[PDB]
Design an enzyme around this catalytic site. Structure first.
Site, PDB file in Angstrom:
ATOM      1  N   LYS A  53      -4.161  -0.343 -13.366  1.00 39.18           N
ATOM      2  CA  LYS A  53      -3.080   0.587 -13.652  1.00 39.18           C
ATOM      3  C   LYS A  53      -3.541   1.819 -14.417  1.00 39.18           C
ATOM      4  O   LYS A  53      -2.853   2.844 -14.380  1.00 39.18           O
ATOM      5  CB  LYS A  53      -1.963  -0.116 -14.438  1.00 39.18           C
ATOM      6  CG  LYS A  53      -1.206  -1.181 -13.643  1.00 39.18           C
ATOM      7  CD  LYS A  53      -0.236  -0.566 -12.637  1.00 39.18           C
ATOM      8  CE  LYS A  53       0.599  -1.640 -11.944  1.00 39.18           C
ATOM      9  NZ  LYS A  53       0.314  -1.743 -10.483  1.00 39.18           N
TER      10      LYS A  53
ATOM     11  N   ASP B  81      -3.650  -2.851  -5.104  1.00 34.29           N
ATOM     12  CA  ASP B  81      -4.450  -2.532  -6.281  1.00 34.29           C
ATOM     13  C   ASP B  81      -4.767  -3.750  -7.151  1.00 34.29           C
ATOM     14  O   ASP B  81      -5.279  -3.581  -8.263  1.00 34.29           O
ATOM     15  CB  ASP B  81      -3.763  -1.440  -7.121  1.00 34.29           C
ATOM     16  CG  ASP B  81      -2.440  -1.887  -7.749  1.00 34.29           C
ATOM     17  OD1 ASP B  81      -2.125  -3.097  -7.777  1.00 34.29           O
ATOM     18  OD2 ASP B  81      -1.701  -1.005  -8.234  1.00 34.29           O
TER      19      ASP B  81
ATOM     20  N   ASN C 153       0.819  -1.208   0.000  1.00 34.06           N
ATOM     21  CA  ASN C 153       0.000   0.000   0.000  1.00 34.06           C
ATOM     22  C   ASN C 153       0.858   1.265   0.000  1.00 34.06           C
ATOM     23  O   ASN C 153       0.452   2.289   0.558  1.00 34.06           O
ATOM     24  CB  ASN C 153      -0.951  -0.017   1.213  1.00 34.06           C
ATOM     25  CG  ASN C 153      -1.990   1.090   1.168  1.00 34.06           C
ATOM     26  OD1 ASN C 153      -2.467   1.464   0.099  1.00 34.06           O
ATOM     27  ND2 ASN C 153      -2.332   1.629   2.335  1.00 34.06           N
TER      28      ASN C 153
END
Ligand SMILES: N[C@@H](Cc1ccccc1)C(=O)O
Length: 483
Positions: free
Chosen positions: A375, A216, A77
């Site tokens: 992304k 992510d 993170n």
């Protein structure tokens, strides 16, 4: 101490800044490697391909809940939404129905605690840039995580000095002293876990497995079959890999390597085979063709990693409280923005490189649904659309009508690379993309409410300040929509 003068300056600067010693030792060892002129080069002659691996799809047995009681989920993170023009934590980006990447992970962790194991631990690896924003959101939304944020949840990424290319001394940038420091890659996780004292506490409390992955990457969820597999095959380090495709030919790949090691003191000499990762930078020029041959090297690292904590503690203790990963020598200027600022090296490691450090190391082929990093805003559009749905256990999976194939989304970089432009585009609604094979957007466009897309749709607008807006309720099928 027999250190170099340049190395001594680094130690002094890091000690003045109260950098923990485990980070210093790790960095100094890398510093010595670079002092020696270490290439990092990995010729094709130094490796062999991997042609066979077990497949997650072929597995069926789920571990029991006791294993989950000894498991730590760790999400990377430290990243900002830099790519999206965002300047705060990427995991706080809204992914779907007002939830973020962080919501989904926390909801998944909560679901497993309620139904499978209350002891399942959740950690976040933060940087200085994501820590505060990661604390207040948890404070606002997951108080049970907030109460133990400092004590149990947060792992702080180290920072190490950038060094001048010519002298290897700590670079100085009076204009902004913070630019003198840089993160050491996600390889730092081991240095941080050890140095902070956390690795030992987790082992002491009886935790056996840590699952590491990107914050992510919403595809990276606890799969109880992987834990059973690690239990059965006595694996200490498991790397989830995916099959390489033409789009992947520039990315790294898995490889085999035969090493012979001289025994230290009373140990016999050992010849063994190890797994490893090779990157583009490490690959020499003549083998580039080889490097891009997906058939020859067919797997790439997802950064979904499964680690036996007690063995990790052991290995790091045998190495002097550190883990010797290949050092990557990032070449930049102290101020990335200023080409005339002093040229520096930033030393970093890849957490996936640790696969070469364990005797019981393995890799397993997983479907690409477990490798879905966001992304680009294009990725974000797909996720937000009705192509993805939320399971009972709070996972994000493709709707069945997609047949395991996600919509391909190509958003015009001129207008939608920034979250700024992207949120305008979906301002009046997110179009239905469940039935769309491919959507392409060129020029300035705005979706309407109730838009539904099927097949292959291109939306193309020629004049720059036009603002071409799709009518509400419009349905596009295999077409090109222009104004
Ligand atoms: N089996 C994957 C496809 C895939 C697997 C492995 C590597 C790349 C792609 C899926 O359908 O989700």
């Amino acid at each position: 101490k027999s250190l170099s003068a340049a190395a001594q300056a680094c130690v002094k600067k890091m000690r003045d800044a109260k950098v923990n010693e485990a980070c210093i030792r790790t960095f100094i060892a890398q510093h010595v490697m670079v002092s020696k002129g270490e290439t990092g080069s990995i010729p094709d002659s130094a490796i062999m391909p991997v042609d066979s691996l077990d497949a997650l799809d072929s597995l069926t047995i789920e571990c029991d809940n006791a294993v989950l009681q000894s498991t730590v989920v760790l999400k990377l993170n430290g990243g900002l939404g830099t790519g999206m023009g965002l300047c705060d934590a990427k995991t706080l980006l809204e992914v779907k129905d007002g939830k973020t990447f962080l919501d989904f992970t926390a909801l998944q962790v909560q679901y497993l605690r309620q139904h499978c194991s209350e002891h399942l631990r959740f950690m976040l690896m933060d940087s200085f840039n994501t820590s505060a924003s990661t604390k207040s959101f948890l404070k606002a939304r997951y108080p049970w995580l907030y109460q133990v944020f400092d004590s149990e949840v947060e792992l702080m990424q180290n920072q190490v000095p950038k060094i001048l290319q010519d002298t290897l001394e700590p670079a100085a940038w009076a204009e902004n002293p913070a630019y003198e420091w840089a993160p050491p890659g996600h390889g730092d996780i081991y240095t941080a876990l050890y140095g902070s004292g956390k690795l030992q506490e987790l082992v002491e409390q009886g935790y056996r497995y840590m699952f590491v992955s990107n914050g992510d990457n919403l595809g990276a969820t606890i799969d109880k079959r992987v834990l059973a597999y690690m239990e059965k095959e006595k694996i200490d380090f498991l790397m989830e890999v995916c099959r390489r495709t033409e789009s992947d030919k520039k990315g790294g790949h898995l490889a085999r390597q035969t090493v012979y090691v001289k025994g230290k003191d009373g140990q016999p000499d050992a010849e063994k085979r190890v797994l490893l990762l090779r990157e583009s930078a490490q690959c020499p020029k003549a083998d580039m063709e080889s490097f891009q041959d997906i058939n020859k090297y067919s797997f790439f690292n997802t950064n979904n990693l499964w680690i036996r904590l007690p063995v990790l503690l052991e290995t790091m203790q045998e190495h002097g409280g550190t883990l010797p990963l290949p050092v990557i020598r990032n070449e930049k200027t102290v101020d990335s923005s200023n080409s005339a600022s002093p040229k520096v090296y930033q030393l970093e490691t890849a957490m996936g490189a640790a696969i070469a450090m364990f005797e019981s190391a393995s890799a397993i082929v997983v479907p690409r649904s477990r490798f879905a990093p966001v992304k680009t805003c294009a990725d974000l559009l797909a996720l937000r659309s009705d192509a993805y749905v939320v399971t009972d256990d709070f996972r994000l999976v493709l709707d069945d009508r997609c047949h395991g194939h996600p919509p391909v989304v190509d958003l015009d970089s001129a207008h939608y690379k920034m979250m700024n432009g992207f949120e305008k585009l979906v301002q009046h609604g997110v179009p239905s993309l469940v039935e769309c094979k491919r959507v392409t957007v060129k020029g300035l466009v705005q979706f309407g409410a109730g838009n539904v897309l099927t097949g292959t749709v291109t939306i193309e607008n020629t004049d720059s300040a036009s603002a071409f807006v799709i009518p509400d309720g419009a349905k596009l099928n295999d077409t090109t929509a222009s104004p």
